[model samples]
Structures are given as structure tokens and as C-alpha cells.
Target chain A: MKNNLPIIALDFASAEETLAFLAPFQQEPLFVKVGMELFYQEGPSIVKQLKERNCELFLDLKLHDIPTTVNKAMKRLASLGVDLVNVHAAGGKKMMQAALEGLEEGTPAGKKRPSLIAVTQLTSTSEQIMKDELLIEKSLIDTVVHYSKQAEESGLDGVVCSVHEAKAIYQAVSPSFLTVTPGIRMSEDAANDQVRVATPAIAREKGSSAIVVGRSITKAEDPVKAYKAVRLEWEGI
Target chain B: NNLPIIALDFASAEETLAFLAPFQQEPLFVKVGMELFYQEGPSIVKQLKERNCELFLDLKLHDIPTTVNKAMKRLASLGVDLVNVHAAGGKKMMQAALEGLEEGTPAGKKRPSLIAVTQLTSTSEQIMKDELLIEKSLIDTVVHYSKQAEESGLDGVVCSVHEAKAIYQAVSPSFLTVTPGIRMSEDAANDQVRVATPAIAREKGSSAIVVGRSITKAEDPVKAYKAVRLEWEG
Candidate 1:
């Protein structure tokens, strides 16, 4: 609904590395995530470069703060004209609504509003950590479901949840509520810090609207080949 | 508590300078959050610092450990008096944030006083219970995060003035608590929910209070600023 799938997480150190990573894809109009790693290293100039290359960007800063702070931050982010952006669902309904308002207020006339998503919880968070550390007593699935519903009520376009929760979210909210999932890995890959893992193929079957694959694709023997493999898997080939 | 800090929540660099014009002789302290920073960029930090103002750069950075680490390095390099992360970012992330500050501060210069946001003044206890589905009372959670932030080597926390004394008891008396949502009298709440007057904020043991609209929105900003200053001094 927003853009093409298998959104490449360009978790690179700098603009040069990002360019090197994207060079192989060569004008493919790829959907990409520009996280804080690259954004802070290179600032918005790299974002402008990605835009010049016809890349659809998900500016995944995952903002969380007071409604006013988040609202203004989203305003500046909206002016960037990316395809999708996100905030933490922990920020609550008014904050999410303020984000949408900020996006609407900041968008130049005639340009479309970027798709808004809320991060339900990080893929790294396990059930124990959620309970002990955050004092969130609900089951992980229920929490994600509740947060997704809250995001929908706040007028967001979708949510960034793990594939483990995507199907459940579709069950809880509408199937039309888009889900962009991270924690996607190939079977042979190490889980690393991500505890809840799903491959792109499994993610697609589980009803994820898009999947974000970081090291599994980026650390491959051939990145372009790896990218194609993921796309193929996510595309149901 | 030291000098009171103003939340310079204006739309432009001109508006920010106009608000500070009256405080030229005095060394002003200010909190520049997302709105002003996003609009004016880094030049503002330079401009404000040139005029001898201590700054609390309140970006409230919240992301993964690795990302927060990197962003904190970039932010700390600016040499603001203070910076904040969200307490909800978890233990490892806050630790990483501290490491970033340690690495980024120039040789012989002290790292910025790091703080974390416990809960925004705009977020009510009811919202925490009903909307966020957290079981802990808002004050309990605020104190818990303050203690955790202290454990993570942060200098303090950004919380409502209501929780400041409790935080002082839970953490040490020295564990700083910076509060926003300050007013003169019964001013409009605007977007903030947990509003407090400067006198009450001081009585409650807030180390510094950030007042935005009460001064900035006034018909006579300088007079409003004097009124706020008097309240805090009392």
C-alpha cells in the first residue's frame, strides 16, 4: 500500500558506505530504511541523495517524547518527503495523533502525506525483558495487538511489529492495517541480538506488508544476489 | 537549584533572540527542545553559547542501543550543559548513551550532564494506566526510572515537579530532576497536562524548572519573565 516490499535496512556507518551498498541495486527504486546510525553520521544530505536515486525511504528514527516535542520532530521529518516514518507506540494516543497532525501541518501543498507507523515493541525484546524490565505484564502478543489497535485509532497507517505478531495483528486489527516487520533472517543465519526471528518467506505467509532484513542480506557473499533472493522469497516466488 | 531555565519554544531564530534580548547582561540558561533545534539547526547552539548561556539540549533521544550510542556521540560533541534520553530505552541503551558522552567530550572537558525522561508532564497517570497499560503508579514509575537512570550513570532525570521530592528520596538528594510545565498563576494548560507553578516547583525540590508558554506567550514577555523569576526566587 505504501511502496514495494523487502525494505533494505541501510544500517551503514556513513553516506559513502550507504552509496556503496546501494550501488549494486542501481536505480531499482528500492524501499529502504534510514535509521539513526546513518542519519546522525551523515545528516539529511544522505537522505537527499537517496531521494535523488529514486529510492523510497522509511525514516525509521522511532521517535518517543512529549506530544509537542514529537509533533515538531515529525513536522521536520515530514518536510523530508519520505515514503514512511514511525514513532514508538509507548508514546500513547495523543502523541501519535499529534504526530499525524504535525505531518499534515508540515507537508507542502500537493505532496502526499507519508505513511505513519508505530513501533509496537523492538524485535529484541523478549517476554521476560518486557515483564521484568519494563513492568509490562501483558503477554507480548496481547501488548502488540493492543498497541496496534491504539495506533490505528490514532490515525496511523500501520505498525512496525515482528512477523511473530503480524498474523495476530491482522486477526486483531484489519488485514488492511499494514505491518512492516524486522527480525527477518535466513535459516542458516545467527539470531544475533534479535530473539524473535522469521525469514522473509515466513514473514510473507504471516501477513507482513513488508520485511526489513539487515545483516542476513548485507553480509552475504554477494549483496545484490542476496537482495534478489529476499525479494523473491517475499514476493512468493 | 541553580538559575531557572526557559524553554525557548519559538518558531524562528528571530523569536528566540527576541525572548533572550532582555537577559543580555545576565548569563541565561535555556532548554532548546525539538522544535527550535529542528528549525534553526546547529548555528543556534553556537549563537546562544556565544552570548554566554548554559543550554539543556533536550532532544530526548530514544532508539536502539547502537543507534542511541552513535547519536549521543554526535550530540555530546556540541558541548551543551545537558542532554536527555528516554528512560524507556532500557538499560543497555542508557549505558551505551553514557559511553557515547564519555567518548565524544573533548579531552579535559567534562561530559555533558546526562538525564533521561521518566514521563512527560503532558502524560497523566490515567493515560499511563489505561492507555500504556502500565500497572505501577506514575510516581512509583517515575522514581523507579530515576533510580535506574542513576544506576546507568546519568546525572539526573526530566520529570514533572510533582515527583521531584520522591525522586530525591529514592535516588540521592543530588540526583538532579529538571521539570517542565511551569506557570505563574492559573495559566492555560495548553498541551501540557501536569502543570505546576514555579513556587510549587521550588517547594517540591526541582533542581531546575523549564517554563515555556507562561513567558513566551505573554503580551509582555519580559514582564512575564520577571514574574516567573520572582516566583522561583521566592
Candidate 2:
């Protein structure tokens, strides 16, 4: 959970595309995110295959439901052998607590439970979108920071946030509390659908515990090279 | 797709099956919400399908468009009668969801009908305005979401009984309005802020109604279900 590696968001449509993308990185120690797209397409087999490759996985389903339901869902997800998992912080403190409980109860006796995180606000959501669409009155930073604190209070390991809010979040919560930032784009890469984006260096400077780079690496002409570039920037090499 | 769809809001598959034991003879239309579905996973869906129950798999998935698309594809293969996503996820996500369902469904099998959740029944007008900070009236918001869903090629929407009639008016009358928060006249409203009796739901243009605690927690669930069916049918 505290690793400094870039969590590559395997944003491909199928397991074939995802595995093909990772083929070159087979020898590397990679931390990858198996988000809803690939997970839903291939189911648990994708996670199993990734584990076979000795990759660290973040099962990013972003579960949001009532307390009991979220709890049970987390319990089911716990057995998937992923290193990190997440839920929406908007589900409230009790639901977050239930998720933690489910993880604790469902994890195998000898194994460690996946480090739980809560998503504060999606990287794609801008301040205008938050106000106009989501109808949240608070400033975007305040909301993300508040949600991060709530996640901490509910015994979560960290939160999924934009790099823009990572510094303030670490200030508000414990510095050790993970801020796994997505919306990572390299200098030459297009921002795509992501509104809040930063290079891996910015993420490091902003105090992000980890960075989730998706299109920048996944869509690159040479993904391994893109991965290394991100790695170098993230490591301040 | 059937009237008075029972919300199987139990924690586990065992409790859900035990509650459905008496209704074995009937081909019941039931909702498998997050509680039971999350706990048991697809195995519960298989069990429900084996029992010949019509399922509305209510996950209300809200995420990025690509993710929602793939997830819908997977859920569609579960062979449930229906599924849903949050309308707040926007037109692109809803459109992606429909495409995923179409692609993932088995060749011979009909794709599951997809719906969008307009607003949860638990959310009141005050909460929508004050806390969520939506300046629009609750009805307006629901109607707008329904219109958006219809435009995005969804089959219907999950809405409170109060907004079903208005939703139908905004969209086509054929645009399904599957209303939850259904209670009998004698039943308590419980956590639901927007609620109507089964008969009221029928009169208000709801294509289907989802009843949870009133029937599920009843001493004689079969009898309660029958009563709701009668009220809805009449």
C-alpha cells in the first residue's frame, strides 16, 4: 500500500488487450489497477492471471451502497488477493467502517487484508461539474479534503484523489495516509477526459503516496517506455 | 417486468431463499439489490434464475463511462431480467451501458432491460435542495433525468412513486417507470422519504413497483404479496 511505484490503470476493454499490454513488463515488478472495465469483462480470472504474473493489484470497483451491502461486497472482494481496494467516501462513515470490517473478516488467516481506500472525487470531475451536476456547494478542494479526513476517521488506509488536492489532504490527515492519485499525464500526453491532471513529478511534489497512470502509458506507442518515463518522473530520477 | 416486484433485501442468499420458499409455485419478479447480490455474488443470481424468478439486479452502478460499459456487459450475462445505473452518471455513461448490455448478452437470450436510477426513494426534497444543493425542484430533476435516460436509450428508470407519473409525461408513456418505495396503506413508511401504496403506484402510472420490508418482513409474506398483487392488479 505504501509503495512508490506508479499504479498503471489497465484501462483496456478486454483481458487480452490488458495482458498483451503487460507482456513486455513481465519481468518488471509492477503495481497495476484492475478497474471495473477489465474486471467486469473477464471476472475473477483476470485478477488470478495478474497474480500469476506476480503483479500487485488494486481492485478499483469503487463500491457504493448501504452499510450492510458494502460490507458484504467488501467481504466477497477480500478473497480476490488484490493488494488494494476502494469504495466511495460518499457512502458515509458507517459504510466505510463496514467495508473495513468485511475486509478483516473475509481475508484468509495467514494473509493480509487489502489496503482499503475511499474515492473522494473523481479526477474527471471539475469544480464546475461538482457544483452544476453533483450539486455540491462546497469548494472542490474542501470536499475532497473533508472526504479524505472522513475516510481516515473511518479507519481507511487512504483516499483516491486528484494530485491537485493531495498536498492539502496530507496536511489535513496524516502524511502517512495514502493519497493514490489518478489523472496522471506526461508532458506530451493529451489530458483526454480527465480535467485534473498532473505529471508524475508533480504528483511526487504534491505528496501523492502513489500515482495511477492510465491513458498516458496504456495508449502510448510503447507502453513500457511510457511506464519507465512515469517511473523515472515519479522517483525524481 | 412483473407487477409488485419484491425487493429481496436480505443479507444472505439463504435468508432470501427461505423467504421465497412458499412462493415456489409462483414465477415471482424480484429485485436483488446490493445487500444479497454483493454477499453471494453471481451464484445468487444463478439460484434465482433457476427458480424461474424475474430479477431486477439493482446495483445502481455509477462510474466512468468505460467502466460502466464493461460492468454492464458482465451483469447482462447474469441473465437477470433487468439492471440499472445512476442517471447522474450522465448521458455518455448511460449510452455506454446500453451498448455493453447489447454486446455482452448471449446470442439467443434477450439482453436485460436497462434502467437509470433518478433519485433514491430515501432522499427527500429537503435533502436534495439543502444538502445536495440542487436548485431545481425535485420533480423537475427527476423528469430531466428520466428524459436523459430515455434519450440515452434506457428501457426505464427507478424512481419514487410520486415522480413516476411525471416521468412518464416527460418521456414516452411506454418509457417504463419502475417505482420503489411502495408500501401498503397499513404498512409503515420506514426509511423511505417518498412512498406510495401499491394501489397509488398503479394509479400514478408506475409500470412496476418494488416492495421490500412490507412483504419481506410480513408474518405471512405470501399473504402480504397476494394483497399487494391484488391492490396493484385492481
Candidate 3:
């Protein structure tokens, strides 16, 4: 819990591609996010392969369906040994419950079941969309808090909040709640679709358990240079 | 131990249960998606090894017979319990979907249900009126069109939980309402644009639910599951 800052983020194009990229960095940064493109291509094999690498894995599958279907999907993932997983929190409590059922189906005990995470607002949406377009009357903080309680009650490990909403959500959802904050930007980096932008320092100050950063680091001319910038920002210069 | 009612969101043999402990039985039917079928090819029928739990091969198939028939034939061979062809795909496609099963199903094995996809759970009236350039009420369209799917000999139609009741009323009780995009009280998103909770879905008498996210994103998954069952029974 001390000095836990922006964990490294990797959005790979393929399983082999990711495995190759991550091979050298094992144990240096212990967390990563695996999105649809990778999951779709490699499916379960991809989930198992990286987990075998021993870094904390974030399976950002963003599952959405009915209760039975979602439950089977999550529990099925338990066999893969992923550490963290996700679904759309807005999908509802029953869907979340079905997803949770997955933990019960496997093993007698001591088997590792992945932790679940709920996605709040994606960093991509503009505040204008949140306000005028989506017509959400509550402030972002209030809305995130409202959903976090729902996630907790529905039995999610924690939530995917932005740096902006991190503190309030941490307070509302619980300090122990796993806050995997995305939409992270460096002080000098450009903001993408994420509306809740947070500097690594700000994210740590606000208490995010983990952070996912993409293009800012991956697209850099030097991946190591980009990663070090993030580490220094997170741990302080 | 339990087939677990695992809905196959995709059609390929993607090793779905590998994400969990090895299956004592086929955990659930794979909801066959466009990507997997197109990529790896749909060999589900050839692989039919009955696990007793049920195989609802949700192809959500929608296309012309020249194409749909060819697709259903492949699906039938998989020996799946249910097969889907989008209701919106029109009568000919639904008919072909049923016809495709004729050759493969055993005398009493019960050919797969040729289900139809009504409206996508993702779009809404606000989206429809504003985006798709249609004026019909959502229920009216689902009811009016779903009847077409039933008349075409398809057993059921896939739809949103929000519209299940009206479809059930119009299509007759026997017609299955394969509902998807279901939400629970705890998890919240507007992915479908329209919504219903599990309790509401059960009350609407959904023939089967294709839940995806809520359970996948929980803190304590087993507890999340019990809550959903309680809500459904409630």
C-alpha cells in the first residue's frame, strides 16, 4: 500500500506479440491490462499464458450479457488463473451476481479466483456528453459513488475509476476497494478519450490501488524511457 | 458438476471452460459470435458430444437463405440443443435455419431452436427516434416482427428483457424469449441503451437469459451469483 502508484499498462496487438514484449519486464512492474483484441485472438490460452508469467493480470474483457451467460463467463475465467477481471458495472446487480457465481464452481479451496472490477465512465467520453448528452443529473463524483456502492453490493472486487474520481470513489467504495484507475496522463502527455485525467502523483495522492497507462508509454520512442518517467512521477523525483 | 448454463457468446471452440476448472460437464452453450465463426470456421455440429446440460448455440444468425441455410446446416451437425437465426433476418432465413436442422437431428433429439434476434439490446427509442430514422414504438416493432419469426417455424426469438413481455403476449407462451443485455441492481451501465434487472426478467417470463457482465465484474463472484438467483426467485 505504500507508494503504490501507476502500474504499467500494456495493450497488446496479439498474444505472441504481448508475450514477447512482456518477457523482459517481468517483476519490474507487477500489473497489466489485457483488453478485447488480445482476449479475442488467444481466448483462454492468452489468459493462461501471461498469468503463467507471474505478473498481476487485468482481464479487461468488459463482459456484458444476461446473468447466466455472464456468470459462466467469469467463473470460466477462474480456471485461467487471472488476478483481476472486469465487466460493465452498468450491466446491473444480477449480471454481477452471475459473474460472481464463477468463483464458487472451481476447486475445493486455495485455488486462485480472479478479482472483479467494474468500469465506471471510460476516459473517452467528454464531460459535455456526460452532462448534456447522457443527461446524468448527478455530478461525476456522486454518480461514481452511487455505482461503486452498487458494485460492492453486487459483489465486485472494486472498480475502474479515473484519477479525478479516485479519492471520492475510494472513500465511498472503501479504502480497501481495488481502484484500477485508467485514463492516466503524465504532466506533459496528451489526454485521449479519458475525461478523468490524473497525473501519477495526483493518482497516488488520491489513493488508486493500480493505474493503467497506454499510448503515453507504449507509443514512446523508448518504452523504458517512458516507463521510467512514470515511475519517477509516481514515486516522486 | 453443473453445466452451469454457460452461454456461448461466440461460435468457435474457443475453449470457454478453460477459463474455469475443467468441466465435469459441458458448462454451457457457446453463444456463437460473428468474429469466431468467420475466423476459425463453425464446426460446432460435427463436435456434438452431448453433456446433458443443454447447448444453446446462439448464432443470432441473420442472412439470406443462400447463405443462412448453409450456415444452419453446419450448426445442426454440432448437435446443439438450440440454434439461433435472427428473427429480423426475415421469414426465409428463419425457415432455412429450421430446415438446416432437418438432416442432422436424431428422431427425438429435438432440433435446435431457431431463435431470432429482435432489436439489438444496445440501441434504444431515443437512439431510434434520433438516430435510425424510425418512428414505430419499440414494443410494437418487436411484437409485430417477432410474430413473423414464430410464423416462419422458428421456435423462439432473442430479445431484450425490457421487451420480453409484449413479445411473449404477441407470440404465444410456447415461443421462447431468449433475453440478453440483462442487468442486476449492483452493476450499472447503459450498454444496451434499454434495460431490465434479473427480477424483472424472470417476472417477464424470459425463456432463458444471456447475461455477460454483472457476474464477470463482481468482488465476491459466488455471492454475486446467489444474489441473482434470489432476485430471480423473488
Candidate 4:
């Protein structure tokens, strides 16, 4: 299986919230993102429970550190047997290579290796921040494209980029390289401080291989219905 | 109290505690990074806190804004004296970190001092230019980030002592600068691209410095710690 699906961002505070949010699905296959909030609050046990439910977990900790440090962290994350993981592309080739090596070292013999990715630029980082604050002379899209190439060359399976740059990245790197886009919202959603926001349908149209929809699904009055809405848009149903 | 913050980048809690047993004087300021933190988890922080050690939790938290924010909230409750996020995470994420610290901190106790890490001390100017594709000079980038951190309501940043003077001049003199990559004159510089002696670090206006293998791997850790302390005080 390709593992492509509308990955729900489980940005809850506790495992109870995460479990409760997903209970409506009742063992149906889904891709869920276990980011820092739930990870830090609940720790690795959260990963274990989601795996028990047969959910494909994209562990989005975005590990960035010296090569050795990132290597050791990825080793532990790999042992969890999540479906996906990521580091920062800014961490350089050595660190990205170390991340892949660590993941390989930790996975059990028979288990499939998790798809490793690197975050090029966060969706929240605006052009103003990149140019003025970070001093990146390159345009935001160009930088993401450059980082996607670097991550692929360093052996990461893909990159986490906004849907705005996903098509460009998909073209620049091979289409087989996964482009997992986040910051998915509906037309009337609050925007929630995300600088680069896209609707589920818009994301699909932009050629994002997969999308992570957070508050629109997790915080909806009827979460399962919201999840279907995103899926419907993604599938053109 | 301006003594250098020793990075206990050891393999285990037992080794870290063993290295610090001799320097029980006022509980030395220390940094706990991914190596020790991931291996030992909260237990190491709790153990060090029990010994009255002033801690700098140096995971360099860099992720999505919400992820970093939540991580900071959890780190605050550990009661460490200092913690940091990457300035490269951008201004919104840094502000989110401050917000998380505020939300999670207990009523009576003070929040840990929040700082931003500009770039790894292991990173070199050539590496920054060639590999990372950052166009600004190393010191210039550090200074720019330092000023930006100050504007973002952070206490200060974790930077190199080599750039401490430039940063101090750019930001306020009171802005905190906790530098790593410290080595004795005779010691090997190892993998760190920027390094300095304890005396030079003090002279350059580093608020405090962090020495890892220098003291931890020394033949006599206590003796080495004392030597570094004396030089820093000069």
C-alpha cells in the first residue's frame, strides 16, 4: 500500500482526547499525525496505543540537533514503529543521513521501515520572516524547492511543505517523493495564525501527495463527518 | 554565579551524577541535551534538580509552532532554571514558546528563563555558506537573530562566546548569552567549528559558558571544573 490518506493532525493535549477524537472511526484505516503536544504530554505510549488501533502514525517531532543527537533520537523514534517521521532539512546532510541510519538500526528485522521526511519550511513562516528575520535571499517557494532536493539527496523519503509549494516540489524532485502538506483549513475557518492556509480541495488540486488536516477535523462538532468532508474533497466524491 | 554552565553530555545518569559529585558547591549550572535527555528522560532532570543543580534544558526545541509551544510548557514544569528554542523557528514560534511557558508554569514558582539558539556551535562559517546556504556572515546572522530574539520577548539566546561581544553590542548588555564550545588552550577543539578558552569567553562578555568533554572527559573532572571556574572568574 502507498499509505496515502488524509492524515488527521492529532493536536490534542492528552491521549484521552486523541482516542476520544478517533473513537468514531472504530478501527477504520486512517493516517494520524502525532505532533509535539500529544507526544510531550503523553510520551511514546501514545504511539503504542495508535498502533494497537491499526492507525498509521506520522510522528512529526521535526527533530533538529547535532548529527549524533538527532541520530540517537531517531533511533528511539524508529523503535516505535510509526509509519512516518521527519527532521529539519536545515540540519544538513550529515544529520539527515544520521537520522536515516539511526532509523535503520532501530527497526526490527521483519518490520517495514518508517518513511523518513524532512521539513523544508514551516507553513507559519511568512515571506517577511524568511527574508528579513532569517536573512534568506531566496524566495520562499525557491527555498522550499531547494530544501526538498537536498532532503531527497540526503536519503529522506520526502519533505513537509505547504500546498503552495507542493506542486513545485513534486516537479523538482521525483513525483515518487512524498509531499505531506499541513495547515489544511475550510473557507470559513478562523485561520488560527497559520500564514499559509489551504482548503482540502485546494490542497488536492495542487498535487499534494497527502494532506494533514488538523482543527477542521479534530475540533469539529462532528469530527468523523469533518474527516469525511476532507476526504470527499480530496477524492472529488 | 557567572560560572560556566557545564554540558553533561554523558551516556547515563550515573556517569553524570558521578562527574558532579565533587563540585557540590552551590550546585553547578549545567546543560542537558538530547543525548542525555532522550536516554534518561525526566529522571535525569529530576535527579539533578534534587541535587540543587541549576539546569539549562538545551534540546533546542524546533518544530511547528504548536509543537514547540507544547514542549516548552512541559519543560517549564521540570523547574529548570533555563531552556531554549531555535531562533530559526521564526518569530511566531518563539512567541508561541513564551506563551506555552506562561500557560504551564506553576502559580508560585518562577518560569524557567527562556532563550533562543541561533545556530549550533558545531556549525562553521564555511558550512553555513556552503552547506546551509545562509548568505549572511556567521557573526552577522547570530547578531541579527539575537536582536530578533530580544524583540520576540525572549530572555536571550544560546550563542557562541566568539560572537558574544558582537551580540552584546547589538542587543542590550543585559541580554543573556549562554555559549557552548568551550575548550582549554591545550585541549583538542574536536568537531565544534567555533571554540574559546574560559578566560576569552569571560572577556568577550558571555553571560555564561558551557563546556562538555573538556571537564567531563578530563582526567580529574573536579580539578578541571575548578580550573575553568577560576579562569572564568578572572
Provide TM-scores for the models.
Answer: 0.93, 0.83, 0.57, 0.92
lDDT of 1 by residue, A1-237 (tens): 423468888887678888888887895768888987676556567778899888889888787877887887788778878889999999999999999999999899999988899999888778886776676789989999999999999999999989999878887787678898999998788887687899988987877888888888888899888888888888879
Q: Give TM-scores of chain A for all candidates.
A: 0.97, 0.97, 0.89, 0.96
lDDT tens string, model 3, B1-234?
Answer: 111233334323554333322434423443554323323333432343434445565535432343356445645655667666545335655676678677646676667767777666765665434332235776776776688787888777778887887887787788888777767866786455567777787877787776555654657544555565567656
Give fnat of each prediction, in order: 0.40, 0.28, 0.01, 0.41
Highest DockQ scorer: 4
* Standalone chain B TM-score for every prediction: 0.96, 0.97, 0.81, 0.96
CA error at residue A166 for candidate 1, angstroms: 0.7
What tens digits encode model 2's per-residue C-alpha lDDT throughout A64-127?
A: 7556557777877787788999988766676789899989987999999999999888887788
Candidate 2 at B45: error in angstroms?
4.1
Instruction: Summarize candidate 1's per-residue lDDT along B147-186 as a digit string, tens digits.
Output: 8788899999999988988888888777888999887776
- The DockQ score of candidate 4 comes to 0.50
State how far residue A165 of model 3 sits from its true place (Å).
0.8
In candidate 4, what are the lDDT values of residues A1-237, reduced to their tens digit? 123479988888788877887778885788889887776666677888999888888988888877766786777677778989999888788788899998998789999878999998888889888888888888899889989998988888999999999878877888789888888898877767678889988987888878888889877888878887888888877
lDDT head-to-head 1 vs 3, winner: 1
* Displacement of the residue B177 alpha carbon in candidate 4, Å: 0.6
In candidate 1, which residue pairs get closer than 3 Å at backbone N, Cα or C atoms, i.e. clash? none
- Fraction of native contacts in model 2? 0.28
- Kindly indicate the candidate among 1 and 3 with the higher TM-score: 1
Tens-digit per-residue lDDT, B119-169, candidate 4:
888788876776667899999999999988999899999888888888978
Error of 1 at A72 (Å): 3.0
Q: Give the 10-residue window scoring lowest on summed lDDT in candidate 1 chain B.
A: B34-43
Clashing pairs in 4: none
